[PDB]
Amino acid sequence: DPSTIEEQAKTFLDKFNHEAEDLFYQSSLASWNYNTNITEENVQNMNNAGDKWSAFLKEQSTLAQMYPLQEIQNLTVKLQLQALQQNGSSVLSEDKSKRLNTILNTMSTIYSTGKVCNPDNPQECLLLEPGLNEIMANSLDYNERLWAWESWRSEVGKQLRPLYEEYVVLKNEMARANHYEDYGDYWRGDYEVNGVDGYDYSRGQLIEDVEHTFEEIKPLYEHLHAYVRAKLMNAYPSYISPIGCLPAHLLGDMWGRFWTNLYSLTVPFGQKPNIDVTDAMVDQAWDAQRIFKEAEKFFVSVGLPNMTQGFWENSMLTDPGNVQKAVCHPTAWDLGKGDFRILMCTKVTMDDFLTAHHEMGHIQYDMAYAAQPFLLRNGANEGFHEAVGEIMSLSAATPKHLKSIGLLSPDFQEDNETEINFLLKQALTIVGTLPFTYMLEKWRWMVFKGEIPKDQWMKKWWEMKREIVGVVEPVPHDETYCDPASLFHVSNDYSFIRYYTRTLYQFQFQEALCQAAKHEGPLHKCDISNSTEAGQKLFNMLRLGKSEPWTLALENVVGAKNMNVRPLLNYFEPLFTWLKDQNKNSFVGWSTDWSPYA
């Protein structure tokens, strides 16, 4: 009766789960108290609590690398031990890891504090938020947009370039020392699965599937592109070529990540009354508590539990007056030991109603897998949480739903037109960002692999914008630039592909849930409310945490083990065939070599 390596490792993880829930509750209460009541005092407390938790993770990590996964035959255990044994940034030497952090931080403050001052007043400047961003979202003067674009990229980018070079050097050392080939390979690990016969998935299988699904997206995108270039050309006659790429500074935000603001300029049928129940909500005297109550109701409507008493007592659901200050960004906090909170400065609007359904869907996911051991309390892979949150706002924004909750009047006429209006807005948002996202992350994956030398970093970048995205830079940028790094996620070391995969999952789910709901009609009108078979199908994957392979998790909802664009395509197919009609007289696709400056 001696102890097996696995037995020791179970007891190890047992002691670890309780030490951990306590220290993590320390850190997270500290953080909530900083993000709801910013006092240098509470900055100090957040940092001290985060510090102790970091130091405990490092210490248990070093303790757990003494129980070898090779001698462990229990996937739940093996998962926790592998999660616990990543030494990450510590596998570097101390001097180098200190350097890396100084660089990461320098970039992040350079981004948050980057300011550009106009060529006529050197003291009156704008930071990206809220000045430049505001120009790029609203303006219809070409030269103002161009100035925001070039100057943001030349004041801030040209600073980030050397930092980004060294950041790639060090991250690569770290990922190789963590036994990965390059840093991109490390970010791709999130999707890894060994040893689960028939649910396995290797890291390079992610590049294959991303590219394969993008190939079948390309038709829809090319038509959205052809149509949007048509309408922008009608809005900027002497600047856009009817066979060229779209000028990078005319897309609706500082990068062209979302084409959402181009709706005003590309709305199919303007006269049609767009939907916005903001006005109904004031008129029935809806307050935040109402918003979140209707969200609770929606979730309950599908066999899911209502928020904890803790949730209501402790959440921060309204801006807390101008007598104390807080970070106003919806956050769905899972602090542990039963404590679930939401933080949002709610306004009695439509956007905030849809957002509250989203963030409460986060909380729902957090409660479902709470039973799961601590290192498994998380979405199946990096893409799962935000997808779960998105499908709630989908169900919640439909007219069927808005009517049922009395914010819309049964005497509202949906027609082809308003629904094309809706689907086009949806595509300007969802479909637009897709090639953008695949492209940016392909560029980083190559940078890390070493396939794109620094002497061609921007060259290769803008080739890809033209080839993949169908977007062209309005100024030639030498290597003193670093346009990648001018977007938050890039200069703050966040993996980006999670947005591509989230976008494809969310439809894989909705389609599955609406089939569970016995929905008739086009998929974009479907509201899963009042369908316990749907909540149950969903829940059986929610409850999992990341304790099963993300392939099995997915098959629990949608009956298939891998990503698939077909539900995307199907969601948008009305808009597809209307675009295809509208582009008979038009050139579909783009030549890579036109530009506004040659």
Binding site: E7, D339, F340
Partner: protein, 194 residues
Amino acid sequence: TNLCPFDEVFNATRFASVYAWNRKRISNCVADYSVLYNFAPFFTFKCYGVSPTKLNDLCFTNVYADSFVIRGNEVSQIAPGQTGNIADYNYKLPDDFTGCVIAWNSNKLDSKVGGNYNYRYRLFRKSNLKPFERDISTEIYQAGNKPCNGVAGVNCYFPLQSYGFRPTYGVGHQPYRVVVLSFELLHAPATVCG
């Protein structure tokens, strides 16, 4: 013909952490479980083995009152047969249980902002607890294959953990005080009536 001290147990200033649960011999006295059943603040008031309102009309040879604290999620285990973590390593009921099990929130008095680490459980033990057993040993657990001579180190853990009790915890992770009234009745002189 004088009431059985019950406040002395229920409204006692502090409670025992479950691994060292204490036990008062309620005997040679007359019991007020008659009007305490209506105190009406019990998140779990379940007798496993005798009708609840009529325990008055039967005298027992020796009532034993065990009191301790647990988290709500654990209360489910203070039940015959139930084997969670606590009913096999801290306080186990015999499968032929015949007494009562009473439990109420304590978040107000037993919890504190900053963690009340004064109440503890056992999480590691070589073997399951026999019914109604107590273990207050602080001997280091031998999780490994190597000797731990009061070592507290690799594969060797202090067997006692403390509940990090805090008021902002969820209702399942909130402190609950509990009392288990073991009603025994044998040939021994019965002197606990009502």
